Amino acid sequence: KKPPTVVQSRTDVFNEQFANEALHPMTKVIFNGLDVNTEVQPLSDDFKQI
Amino acid sequence: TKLHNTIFSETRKFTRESFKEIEHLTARLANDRVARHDFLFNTSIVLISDYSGEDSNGNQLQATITIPNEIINPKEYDPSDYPLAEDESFFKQGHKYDYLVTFRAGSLTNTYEPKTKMYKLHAALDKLMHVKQRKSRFADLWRELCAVIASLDVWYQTTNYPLRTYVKLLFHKGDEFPFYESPSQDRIIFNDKSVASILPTFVYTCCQVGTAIMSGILTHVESIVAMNHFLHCAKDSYIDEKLKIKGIGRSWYQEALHNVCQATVPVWSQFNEVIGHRTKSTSEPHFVSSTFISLRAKRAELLYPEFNAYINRAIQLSKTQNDVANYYAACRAMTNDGTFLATLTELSLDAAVFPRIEQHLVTRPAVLMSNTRHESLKQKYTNGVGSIAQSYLSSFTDEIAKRVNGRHHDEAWLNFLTTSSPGRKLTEIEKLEVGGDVAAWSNSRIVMQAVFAREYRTPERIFKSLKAPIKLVERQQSDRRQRAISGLDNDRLFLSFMPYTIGKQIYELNDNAAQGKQAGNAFDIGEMLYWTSQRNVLLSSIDVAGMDASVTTNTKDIYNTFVLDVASKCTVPRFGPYYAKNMEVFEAGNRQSQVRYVNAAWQACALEAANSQTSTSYESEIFGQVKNAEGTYPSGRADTSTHHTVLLQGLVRGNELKRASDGKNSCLATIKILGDDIMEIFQGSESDTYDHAVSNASILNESGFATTAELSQNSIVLLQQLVVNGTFWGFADRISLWTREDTKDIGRLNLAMMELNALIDDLVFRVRRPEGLKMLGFFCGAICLRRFTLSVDNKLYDSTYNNLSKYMTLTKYDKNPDSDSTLMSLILPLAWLFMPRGGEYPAYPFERRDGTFTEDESMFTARGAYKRRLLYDVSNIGEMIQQNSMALDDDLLHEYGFTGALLLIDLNILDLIDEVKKEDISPVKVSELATSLEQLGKLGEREKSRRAASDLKIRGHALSNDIVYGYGLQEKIQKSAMATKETTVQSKRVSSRLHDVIVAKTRDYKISTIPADALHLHEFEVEDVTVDLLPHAKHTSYSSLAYNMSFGSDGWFAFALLGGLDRSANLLRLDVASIRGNYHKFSYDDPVFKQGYKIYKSDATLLNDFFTAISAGPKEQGILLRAFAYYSLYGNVEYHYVLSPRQLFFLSDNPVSAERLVRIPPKYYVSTQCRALYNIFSYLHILRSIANNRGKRLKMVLHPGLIAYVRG
RNA sequence: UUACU
Ligand SMILES: [C]O[C]1[C]([O])[C]([C]OP([O])(=O)[O-]P(=O)([O-])OP(=O)([O-])O[C][C]2O[C](N3[C]=[N+]([C])C4=C3N=C([N])[N]C4=O)[C]([O])[C]2[O])O[C]1N1[C]=NC2=C1N=[C]N=C2[N]
């Protein structure tokens, strides 16, 4: 198959042992409405709508 | 074919048919003058180029191959290049071009007749060009140059590398090599007279740069910038230009470390484990930025402008602390070729050992006491540079007089008059009147004392050797200029001995009188690794320049007061040819002689101090007898390491008493002085430390010393080992692989490969690619070290050929009139380069039967009985456990040729050549000589040590020869019979005994397997779950804690996975060798320590008895016992392995650290030592197979006979 | 032809 280049896999063990932190979430603007992030599916697909 | 289209050059490993190709090509390329000329010089390789590449980093670089006209057609002789004075007394003083100027071979010739001084000049300059140019370590000159250039084909797989273009353009004449060396007639004899005189050095420069290309220090395009700089040095004088570049071309990193600026480094703890990493910003302070402006002007004009342009890119492009380390080791190998700088020593007498007076005169002591002759007996200093030194040193005279009191010196005389060497004398007319055997013995120190054993108590013995002139020994180093040192005879060695014993006991008293090099590993630097890791420190590392010269007689006197002032408070009766008596002593501020009571130490020291003759007198083949103008330090006396240690310790420590005397602080931390290398450490603000750093310079400047000048924030050197930022930089070029100039203990033997294995292990943490260095050591191991030449006799020449040609080819040689010995040389096949007893070198992956290959043996592989496992490793160990057999494949070992190599092991040629030399000398003549030696010493009951050695062996088991005392009286005599020769009558009965050894072992051979090995056949099985990585690995992730320990390499991961270095082991080993002759690598063999432990662990109630076979004192007994009890956790005597601490600097000593890495299912714990034996199994296979370590954890399976063997 | 730590 692939298996990559044991130098690059020796730094794989070094990578997944000493992990770190990122991803600051601030942007952060004025919104004079309702800030919608998720949608909701209906709980019961019951009726046809002929 | 040829060596760049082989299957081994592609894989890069040993397929079963690929190994027959490497046998066939190297043996063909070994023993031909012609084939060699084919390989270096086919017409199929293009001329190269305007080449471009990447100079060992991310960026790119281009350079052109330029050859100057001073090499392609050199000038004529120009006899104003080596002028004389108005008389022919000496060379003209202040002459330049003191070394061998490149002048084109032909022009030197004799014209005129065998006298009239100038004839001996042109004859000895011919000895400079034809004799003092070659120094080939293993093979001849051409086999060695072919060993890089073949290995550099196999590694990079092509022939478009541009080093071979320098091989082609510098020398090619189309029929044969431009020059070869004779061996039998000893000179380099030329075949083209129009070729340059300097070219036999350029073999070794092309040798060294290709070693640096292979090491990974230099890339291909960087070696263009290298080679152009070397040939530019060769325009007028190839070494005189190099010695001026040597200072400038490596002082430049302190600018590049300044420019990098903020650089993230590991830090160390007190007990040298890595505890943290911090980012510490390297900007060197304001007063060394003023030293940058003065130095970069000298960089611009003294250097070749392409070598200068390579440096100015490394200042500007460098971005990390790792990045300057890349350029610095690579710019360092551009200024050196490792060639030892050899000329005739009449040229270097003016440069090396002529005394200089740098600026000040040093004034004299107030003499307080004088004996009947007006000479110094007791003396004290008055407001000088010395009064600063005796403010520190005179406090020790009340304690050392109880340590210099309590040795009994006549005993310590015979133990320091070991190391057989020379006396000056050629004995004389009385060499006839002592005996013709002891005529030939008469070189050693222990023998020239034995011949004159009667004279040792007479005081006229020392008086008749002031008449004898001191002869100039010369010895040279890697980068220093041709240096001379004084070989004193036994009586001039005697007067210097009491100042050696007095100045020795300041070492145990003061730490800072410092480190002897017994560690080899990190403890020789574990001081320097710590203080650089710290904050608010500036580090200075001082060499004075030349420190043999500078020591005038007046500066020498500051050590003389310290040696006197100890000896007055002491009580030593008789010392030698003296006795404590009643002398007339003048007491200054008395009129009139008043008789003090003086002891022998007192008398001896006063006489030696008074009497001192300093000149070295060299007999010349040109001149009559040139004599150095005295006032230097004659550096061989006894105290040549203490006189420059005790002095500089008094001057720098005495400074912080004098600075504390007038209201200034001291602000100096620990200082390590191994004379002359001063290295002190400061702390405070950037202004306070500098006010002290000037006065340490200025008092050494007013002591008459030329301190060069070195200091920096985050830079520190000692014993030619650079430490910076908490990382270790290498100095790889100082270990020259291929230049020796020893003329003493030459091997072309098994021992010639031990000289490779010790130097290959010197470079394992000075290299950026240790796998490539294993490629280089293999072919030089293969091509060069291949042929052992032996002189048989004719009748036995027939069957010596027939028996050994059965297994491996033996060369035959053309027959002789009227010497009756034909030469013949055996060819020593490539398996012998891998044997446990032969060449102990680590291998490449072989092929099993199916064949799924072995593990690639890395640079950390341990030697002795482990290379016998490699024989079983080929036979599929995992398979063997399957069939439950100790059985062995004779097919696969005979196919590669392993079977033909262990025959050469069992022939045992080396001790057989030692046996015939041991056969010829009468032990009766030795015993009368050596009974007279124990008359000088003890006196009695050196007999009790011989009795203790013999009582131990007959009751128990053999304690061998060198170690126990009075045998090591006898063994110290033996070395002159070992020295004084092989020659031909003894050599004819070498062949009679060896041929009897041959016909017995050839009559059938099978691989002899021992009951003492079950004890490999264990193999590790990889699993699917990873290790932890030991949190100090995150700290040494950045940046470049050594050279090979870059992030994601083999040596870094071994320092991560195997991990650690304990302090607990190699402090006791650092405590052991303080008994037994410490100053270097001291690798673990130590035949006291292993032989004493095999009695201690298994056996000891006898262990009272062989301590007086050492004649170990009660203190000396206490050192060894603490090391024996700590060496009982690990490991086994039953399974032998040897590595060196030079091989594994930061890697752990202990197999305890590897038991974390391998589980053993605990039904295998089956004997009392068997936990401690399985650790070495876990210890070695991690270090052996580190290039194939994903970071999985391996698990051990065993053969049931290995379970069965350790049960007992 | 060849030193000491
Ligand atoms: C007894 O015997 C002996 C020995 O063996 C010897 C040695 O030899 P070798 O060295 O081995 O040779 P080599 O080196 O091998 O060679 P090569 O290198 O291979 O090649 C070669 C070459 O060489 C030459 N050659 C030269 N030279 C000079 C010579 C030669 N050869 C001969 N044979 N000779 C001579 O001289 C060429 O050229 C080429 O090229 O030795 C011996 N040894 C010797 N001698 C002696 C000895 N021992 C002791 N003693 C003495 N005297």
Ligand SMILES: O=c1ccn([C@@H]2O[C@H](COP(=O)(O)OP(=O)(O)OP(=O)(O)O)[C@@H](O)[C@H]2O)c(=O)[nH]1
């Ligand atoms: O074989 C040796 C090598 C070195 N030494 C040691 O050499 C010291 C004196 O030699 P120096 O160390 O003072 O030479 P130098 O540095 O001033 O020369 P440059 O680098 O400036 O060119 C002595 O104090 C001693 O201990 C020997 O005694 N024997």
Ligand SMILES: [Mg+2]
């Ligand atoms: Mg020095």
Ligand SMILES: [Mg+2]
């Ligand atoms: Mg030095």
